[PDB]
Design a protein around this ligand. Structure first.
Ligand SMILES: Nc1ncnc2c1ncn2[C@@H]1O[C@H](COP(=O)(O)OP(=O)(O)OP(=O)(O)O)[C@@H](O)[C@H]1O
Ligand SMILES: Nc1ncnc2c1ncn2[C@@H]1O[C@H](COP(=O)(O)OP(=O)(O)OP(=O)(O)O)[C@@H](O)[C@H]1O
Ligand SMILES: [Mg+2]
Ligand SMILES: [Mg+2]
Lengths: 459, 338, 338, 338, 338
């Protein structure tokens, strides 16, 4: 009559939760070479990444530098929101203008600007030249490295040192070969492209193609700019932030909450989907159950982020006693999301690349990388050297009531270049695909697990 | 035909006991802000606490100062009985004279079993005690039930009687039939507990709470979970398992409000401090023969309440009564691996 | 259709074996004061001990001094056979000449298998031994059963014969059929046991005791739990699983009454001390090729009996036969984590 | 209605995998003496070894000296393929020219997949190799099966073809249908294995052996257990799980007969010693980028055989074929606690 | 002919420096009970303390609370200057308003060098400070001497001026010539001192005190030993070496009276808390970029005074001036070996 674990309710202990260390991938019939495996996967319904890895929206993980590096690597990055709205929109704009391409509308400064401002802009956008346009948008000059290399007074106005108009310019729709001929004939490096009135429209240089050679795996929109995501909360400040990010050209908005099974989060997701659904994709916050994922799918989210207290010694488990083992959580959420074609992003609990392979095989479409990327060079922070080791050194916007920082009453080690970590994770994933006979990530999502005991984990 | 673990009786191994580390609380639909969650709960049938935490009646935990601090914090304190009867009544009066229907601080006091225990209980009731806890290591004993029933008949109209520590449904049912106003649960709940090591006796606390709640919930008798706690998450798990209040022991032993004087030895701070340890089967009867300072009680209580409110927000529990309906997920050994 | 752990045979992995750390005694309705609990139990069909403890027949544990101390303490000792026949008979005579119906101290002695074992057994019976134990690493052998039957026919009217170590129901039934008056149970019962590591052979002790008791209890044959004991709680668990006595080995190896001379090396006290180790499958045959002092025997026996009495009080067991009906709760891996 | 471990697919978690530490061999009725137990077993359909041990085809374990020593010890060795084809043929000839029907020592050699592997295999067969092992990290591949079938058709009348490592019943069945004379089993069998950590791929070795034996036993194809062994008890467990032979890897890496030269560094003895590591999914492809001395091979082989003989004596197995029918007891996590 | 330690200049290695660990106090004829020993000593030419202990002027040691406690204990405190002038003056006023000829507590304050230092000093004198300490890491500098002279000329009639840290006889003589009322001694006195490791600069404290006393004693200028102290025996040695008072630094850093708030992190208690650190050669300029709790000041002061009184009893010194005539014995390296 009684439940074996106590009581009379058979649903009091709803399930047995499996974590990553509880399962292994069973080898299957395979003709898949690890090198030839296709690791591309859907981040959302409309967005497909070459590498199914997304950097977590953590203040110590993803800023514009990390987002650019992740986009160039074939994945994507989500910009953290622990900063002012203006700063986050600026990071979005930096990522979008890192590899503009197409129109490549050039960053322009007013003649009333100063050399310090143009130096800051050059450092921000990784460029060595700025056209100068007046109040009406008409060209008035251009500034480059040769114009200000040794200038002493950084207060020198742009009009004082810019190359005065007229200049060597081309018209809108000028052919690429004609632009190359002009560049070779006049030996100028940055050729402005003007409209039919005198107002600047673009700038022609082959380096955008050159960077395409440098990073063939970059994930981009149709406009040829790098894809980027941004985290938002819930509320009116969150709505203002989301509108600003959409204006800046963000591609994915993620309603980032610790507990997405909440009417506020669902209403925010529905509002964003109705307002800016055609332009950007909306991803719902962290869930750990089938019902929460179903609620997010009903709210119209384009992808569902999964994980609530996934780590074993997670702060949420210790302080709140709340959590869900990640493999079981992913299985439960996929059972709700897959019939509607909604991708699942596994966030949290990863320690090795084998865990990434298991998370994808459990049914998730992408893995969100957090603490594994926190110490890399591309992550925000500055390198310092203490003792014999290198570390990384460096609220109003921490508005989540269930976030772990509300629980904790209170250095980040260096992890090396991002490329090495991404390469190792991809190699592990490709080896898993070869072992399981999975040519694609969709096939890998059909792979079977074997459950292991405690003796299988002992060193 | 035979049992998979040996023998022929399928009831020889009666149950699989779950501890706090075995389970986690599953997130559920929530419209509850942790700051706005109501943490009040019933201590007994007639007493409700703002904060569902009671200090254990241990000589190293609760005397008058700790009882006053716990009552002011929104909980309560039970005065330990490893002292003379007149001294215990004096501590009761010290707490009272410093909330009930008359506006004085609430206090509980522990008594044993026997005629000396009867005199102690009468003196404590005279001093104005609110809760009498018949405290024993093993309450599934006819003497404990007789003492509970006698106290209920004598002073039940004015005081609440709480029964001793149980670990099974049958023991909780027996205490309820004896007229106890609350049932205290736990018999060797710790993993390294002296009862488990020396006597081989114990019951994992989650299963014990589930069984005792199955016994007590139909009759409206609150359950006090005592022992096995290590973190505020364990408080949340115990309340979700069905207990109405939690009892705090070693978590409060070294706090400033707890007894003992502050000393400084070897660069670290400690608290330095029988004819009244009449209880058989107690852990002090099992052993062959310096508690560190832990800071003010307010910080510990704040941390525990913050953890509880976080759990309530995660599970969508507006009240403790709603948290008692929350679901668990059982984790494997890999879930405990660091 | 296939077995979840592999293959097609569901009997390939016969059972889930429980050890002492897997289970705890559940508290039950109790009127038993630990001091008044009766710890008397049957060693064999005709021998009852005041304290259900038997010193193991190990060269480092039991000879005449230890046997006398164990008999005086209310238990018994079995003399080890890693010595000449004349020496063993002399130790038997020493123990006897220092209780049976005559009033001399009870003593047992271990014998092997073979013609030399027969000579040893007859010499020991002449010397006045009370219990003969056919001590084998694996008693489920036709030679061991034939030896037990022969001893039962020859000297069964005057002494008792106890079969060697078994770990399954079938082996215990085979020993009972051969006429053994008690069955010694345990084959690689320790976790890090040499039999488990070198040979890959073992059986968890709780499950082994349950199976052996299922084989022996209908015939009234006592069960001696030998091996795997680490604490007095393990003694309580072994007796609760159905065993009538617990055999104490390494826990008595370094006691003052155990053999060996006391030496003082590096500021610590140790005890410093083959043709007769003829048993194959014994742990000495598996190894490729200093026991600390543990104090007086009285302290160890007192602690073990105190743990047993506490368990009896918790379970409500007035006698060992009532303790044998006690229930277990199985605990998870998290219940063993520190 | 949904699976208790998540989702709605009951076959998503196909099985519970058991490793060596999860099980123990149960004792059984035994008339077997360890010294008189017959340890012979089939390496392939046509080759029987006196001792069921095969040195792994690892660059750090087996070349001509190790192969000669293993052949003299009653087992066999497989020569590693991490070297030029002519060099491997020279090692084969060195082993042969120092048993088969012609009185020369038996030897095996490892080959990969591809045209260079075909040339290597033909050269080795011409050199007098007795067993060709199509050694792959993942043998459930169409190319590996085609290579095995081609080798069996071409040179199957003179040499034996053993298929690469598998971990499931289906893969073993595919290898058997392809004509493999033996099936090697194990894919990430170790607990801290590189394949498990980096790729997330593995199979507990006892379950894998049981499944592959379920595939291979009806057709009389022997199973070689490769990997996951730590002790001779693991050898016994693997052979009882159904494997015919055990392949020894890290246990032989630092032996005197293994390749490398002896050096003395920091007071300890060590051994100091690509285009041919063409295998994908191998552990050397997964890592980002000094093996100690282990003494003479004879000592290791003697210890392993002693453990195996002890297990055969305990289980009552006169032959390896009888040992393959022995039962297991599954142990809990508490059974591993030291 | 050449120097035995290298070179030709015999004064290149000027001296062999003795630290506290190098020397011990020799017992002498004694009619002095430690209880009746007079520990009073001159802080400056015009200020006498009951206990010769001064609290170091470090941001983590002395502000108003510590200064008040030190003044009540019979010693004195010097206020640190890592804060705005107005704040230091406010702390001076807090100490004074809470002993001099008017019955207010004595207090001292540190000042730097420069015009802002002059403004700070004038404000502090207006606030009623008793001692001004021109505190510098290296006082053998013309700026420090000029500042001491200017303060002596301006406010020498009302306040006492103490010179900064010196380590040589010449520096102490320069400070005495400049008009310092007391000379503070010590430059890199610790063994693991940052000044020694980073700059290679230091002086063992016993030798530095002896040299400074050689410079100062004929002029009646007291010596304040600052730095290098580890135990109360070091206080006794420093006073016996000729110093009149000892300045306590890191020994008082974690005491309750020291600045900072008590926090409890990881089970341990700590104290948790630039434009004003203008001094060059200070140790914060050399370092590339939580202080534990130490209990009440009373315990530390009582222990130090007890050690001093024990030394006075052992040497037969009725007064501190007699302790300044005590003899040392130099001990070898084996005298430091545990
Ligand atoms: N103002 C701008 N706004 C947007 N994109 C720009 C801007 N200026 C340059 N870029 C892009 O970034 C690239 C940076 O090259 P740029 O010519 O600025 O650097 P450089 O140091 O002069 O190069 P190099 O001397 O190596 O040819 C350009 O080729 C163009 O694709
Ligand atoms: N389209 C243009 N027409 C006319 N002058 C131009 C044009 N672009 C740049 N200049 C001028 O030509 C000079 C060199 O500019 P250029 O773009 O070659 O420098 P840069 O890209 O900074 O090269 P470097 O890498 O050598 O510093 C400057 O005086 C600049 O103002
Ligand atoms: Mg340039
Ligand atoms: Mg250039």
């Amino acid at each position: 009559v009684p439940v074996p674990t106590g009581g009379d309710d058979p649903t009091k202990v709803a399930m047995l939760g499996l974590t990553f260390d509880d399962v292994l991938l069973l080898p299957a019939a395979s003709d898949v070479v690890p090198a030839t495996a296709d690791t591309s996967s859907q981040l959302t319904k409309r967005i497909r990444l070459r590498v199914p890895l997304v950097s977590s929206a953590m203040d110590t993980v993803t800023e514009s530098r990390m987002a650019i590096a992740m986009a160039r690597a074939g994945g994507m990055g989500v910009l953290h929101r622990n900063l002012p709205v203006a700063e986050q929109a600026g990071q979005v704009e930096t990522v979008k203008r890192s590899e503009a391409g197409m129109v490549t509308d050039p960053v322009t400064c007013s003649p009333d600007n100063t050399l310090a401002e143009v130096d800051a802009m050059c450092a921000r956008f990784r460029i060595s030249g700025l056209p100068v346009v007046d109040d009406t948008g008409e060209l008035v000059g251009i500034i480059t490295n040769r114009d200000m290399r040794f200038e002493v007074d950084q207060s020198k106005p742009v009009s004082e040192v810019m190359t005065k108009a007229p200049l060597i310019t081309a018209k809108e729709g000028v052919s690429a070969e004609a632009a190359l001929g002009l560049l070779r004939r006049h030996k100028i490096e940055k050729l402005p492209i003007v409209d039919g009135h005198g107002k600047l429209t673009g700038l022609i240089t082959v380096k955008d193609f050159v960077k395409t050679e440098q990073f063939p795996l970059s994930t981009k929109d149709s406009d040829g700019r790098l894809l980027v995501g941004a985290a938002v909360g819930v509320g009116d400040d969150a709505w203002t932030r989301a509108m600003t990010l959409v204006d800046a050209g963000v591609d994915v908005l993620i309603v980032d909450t610790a507990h997405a099974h909440n009417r506020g989060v669902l209403d925010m997701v529905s509002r964003l989907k109705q307002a800016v659904g055609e332009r950007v994709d909306v991803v719902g916050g962290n869930v750990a159950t089938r019902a929460a994922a179903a609620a997010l799918v009903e709210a119209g989210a384009d992808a569902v982020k999964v994980g609530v207290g996934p780590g074993s010694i997670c702060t949420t488990r210790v302080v709140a006693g709340v959590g869900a083992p990640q493999i079981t959580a992913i299985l439960e959420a996929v059972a709700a999301c897959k019939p509607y074609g909604v991708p699942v992003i596994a966030d949290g609990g990863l320690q090795y690349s084998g865990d990434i392979a298991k998370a994808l095989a459990a049914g998730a479409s992408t893995a969100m990388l957090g603490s594994l990327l926190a110490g890399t060079a591309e992550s925000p922070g500055e390198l310092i050297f203490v003792n014999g080791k290198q570390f990384k050194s460096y609220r109003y916007f921490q508005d989540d009531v269930l976030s772990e920082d509300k629980l904790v009453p209170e250095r980040v080690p260096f992890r090396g270049p991002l490329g090495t970590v991404i390469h190792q994770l991809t190699g592990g994933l490709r080896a898993a695909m070869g072992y399981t006979g999975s040519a694609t990530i969709e096939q890998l999502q059909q792979a079977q697990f074997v459950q292991i005991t405690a003796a299988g984990l002992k060193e």
